[PDB]
Design a protein around this ligand. Structure first.
Ligand SMILES: *[C@@H]1O[C@H](CO[C@H]2O[C@@H](C)[C@@H](O)[C@@H](O)[C@@H]2O)[C@@H](O[C@@H]2O[C@H](CO)[C@@H](O[C@@H]3O[C@H](CO[C@H]4O[C@H](CO)[C@@H](O)[C@H](O)[C@@H]4O[C@@H]4O[C@H](CO)[C@@H](O[C@@H]5O[C@H](CO)[C@H](O)[C@H](O)[C@H]5O)[C@H](O)[C@H]4NC(C)=O)[C@@H](O)[C@H](O[C@H]4O[C@H](CO)[C@@H](O)[C@H](O)[C@@H]4O[C@@H]4O[C@H](CO)[C@@H](O)[C@H](O)[C@H]4NC(C)=O)[C@@H]3O)[C@H](O)[C@H]2NC(C)=O)[C@H](O)[C@H]1NC(C)=O
Ligand SMILES: *[C@@H]1O[C@H](CO[C@H]2O[C@@H](C)[C@@H](O)[C@@H](O)[C@@H]2O)[C@@H](O[C@@H]2O[C@H](CO)[C@@H](O[C@@H]3O[C@H](CO[C@H]4O[C@H](CO)[C@@H](O)[C@H](O)[C@@H]4O[C@@H]4O[C@H](CO)[C@@H](O[C@@H]5O[C@H](CO)[C@H](O)[C@H](O)[C@H]5O)[C@H](O)[C@H]4NC(C)=O)[C@@H](O)[C@H](O[C@H]4O[C@H](CO)[C@@H](O)[C@H](O)[C@@H]4O[C@@H]4O[C@H](CO)[C@@H](O)[C@H](O)[C@H]4NC(C)=O)[C@@H]3O)[C@H](O)[C@H]2NC(C)=O)[C@H](O)[C@H]1NC(C)=O
Ligand SMILES: [Zn+2]
Ligand SMILES: [Zn+2]
Ligand SMILES: [Zn+2]
Ligand SMILES: [Zn+2]
Ligand SMILES: [Zn+2]
Ligand SMILES: [Zn+2]
Ligand SMILES: [Zn+2]
Ligand SMILES: [Zn+2]
Lengths: 209, 209
């Protein structure tokens, strides 16, 4: 003992696509083997909200409870900086334990997206790297994926975002393809999601030149 | 109470340059306000070693001691996977608390190093990105820097290493330069240090073409 509260954000990309339902999740742990009532109260910017889905408590293998409250936030609200208080009242807590969360703050910056060919040097090999530079973005929440005519591409990795000398973020995502696919003339396209982009999406294509 | 031991590695690049003196550092904390004797014993692969520099204990502002033992390791030994035991004997510890450390294990893989020009698209701007791809390396310990004819370059950032789909590591380092420097014909050079490279160094240059 005693109770600890953790409040978790939605996934970046559930926030970046209107077609998705982003949730903030409120988790309470160390609720006593003994005193098991827990109340949740939830607020958006101060106004109390009554829509959260609270689950029946689950007993952990360490003789302690754990209770969860999911609130669904609106695409517009989250992106618009609204603040989300989860307030947790136990009879084991002398003051309700509270926690607030919102999207990452700071002026939004729209990423520049660049696609880069394989070096003269890589062209020896039986596989090549296609490179997606994404720079000057802010905040760091981002999703990056590759696709080729319709279906997406397996063999890609993306770096975490890195903080740049101007307070902004950059990132590279590397697509690896069979050299035969690149020389054929197959179009490849790096798609980026970020809040600051129009409709939070853009896409840059790269082809054999 | 009671005592906790942390054993820290050298810096990657002190390990990658023969001209440098790499140290493993053994730190003991939570040594009691009361029982202040601490003994260190140190081993390389089992054989006890007698060369470590031990500092006089420093009292922390939380009413507790902290004592440090630095051992200097040899360039050859560290790279060669030797193991470094720091053994800590307090009278508050019913068994000596021990800790071992070595270089990251696994078969070494030599990085491929590629330099990449600015996209057709970036060339509009008054600053451009020069890109250094480093891929297929193992282990992840690496140092990457840019220089231009002699002195090094300020405005660069490098991503952390990322784990690739083949168990190896890649990384990109981005140099930003004034577009006037790039068009002049100024040579730029990405230098990489990694254990698997000949003499643990290589360097790839990039120029206006
Ligand atoms: C008794 O047992 C309890 C647990 O039961 C089991 O736990 C098992 C793992 C194992 O141990 C079993 O044997 C055991 O039976 C145990 O409870 C645990 O207590 C810990 C605290 O003591 C908690 O640790 C915290 O973890 C946080 C990270 O939590 C995520 O990651 C962990 C590790 O991987 C993971 O296990 C958790 O489940 C959790 O995962 C995330 O959960 C959320 C919500 O479900 C998801 O979010 C949603 O995802 C869904 C997916 O459908 C959907 O997409 C939604 O949209 C989205 O919202 C995540 O996706 C999900 N991810 C994963 C990977 O599953 C840490 O953040 C936290 O660190 C913070 O606090 C620490 C102090 O304790 C400290 O180290 C650190 O400083 C840090 O600080 C805070 O956080 C801020 C960071 O932003 C800081 O700014 C601040 O400093 C500070 N915040 C403030 C303001 O205070 C911490 O380590 C652990 O969660 C909890 N376990 C569970 C399962 O809840 C308990 O402790 C045991 N008791 C005893 C007596 O010891
Ligand atoms: C009383 O006060 C004590 C400290 O005094 C002051 O501390 C101040 C910061 C502040 O609090 C003051 O108010 C206070 O007065 C306090 O002591 C602290 O105890 C903590 C444990 O309870 C320790 O935390 C650990 O930290 C580790 C990281 O340590 C580095 O980073 C921290 C955070 O930045 C930094 O402060 C430390 O100084 C340390 O820095 C590094 O130090 C070494 C050696 O000096 C350097 O290495 C050398 O660099 C030199 C430079 O000249 C040269 O280049 C050499 O070649 C090179 O060797 C580093 O460069 C240097 N870096 C920096 C940034 O300075 C964490 O690793 C560790 O995490 C691990 O354990 C945790 C459990 O406690 C856990 O969270 C986690 O699971 C993790 O697990 C371990 O580690 C492995 C990771 O590889 C895992 O695999 C394993 O799970 C596990 N290992 C095993 C096998 O067990 C942990 O958090 C803290 O170091 C210590 N503070 C100091 C100053 O020593 C004390 O706790 C207080 N007591 C009470 C009653 O509370
Ligand atoms: Zn607030
Ligand atoms: Zn736009
Ligand atoms: Zn529109
Ligand atoms: Zn929107
Ligand atoms: Zn060992
Ligand atoms: Zn070689
Ligand atoms: Zn040689
Ligand atoms: Zn060497």
């Amino acid at each position: 003992g005693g109770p600890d509260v953790f409040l978790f954000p939605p996934k970046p990309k559930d926030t970046l696509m209107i077609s998705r339902t982003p949730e903030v999740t409120c988790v309470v742990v160390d609720v006593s083997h003994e005193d098991p009532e827990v109340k949740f109260n939830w607020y958006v910017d101060g106004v109390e909200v009554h829509n959260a889905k609270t689950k029946p408590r689950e007993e952990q293998y360490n003789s302690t409870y754990r209770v969860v409250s999911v609130l669904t936030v609106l695409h517009q609200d989250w992106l618009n900086g609204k603040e989300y208080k989860c307030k947790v009242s136990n009879k084991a807590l002398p003051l309700p334990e509270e926690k607030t969360i919102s999207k990452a703050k700071g002026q939004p910056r729209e990423p520049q997206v660049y696609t880069l060919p394989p070096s003269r040097e890589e062209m020896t090999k039986n596989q090549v790297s296609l490179t997606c530079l994404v720079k000057g973005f802010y905040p760091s929440d981002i999703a990056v994926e590759w696709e080729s005519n319709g279906q997406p591409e397996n063999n890609y990795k993306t770096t975490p975002p890195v903080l740049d000398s101007d307070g902004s973020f950059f990132l590279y995502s590397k697509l690896t393809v069979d050299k035969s696919r690149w020389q054929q003339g197959n179009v490849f396209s790096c798609s980026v999601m970020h809040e600051a982009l129009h409709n939070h999406y853009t896409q840059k294509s790269l082809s054999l030149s």
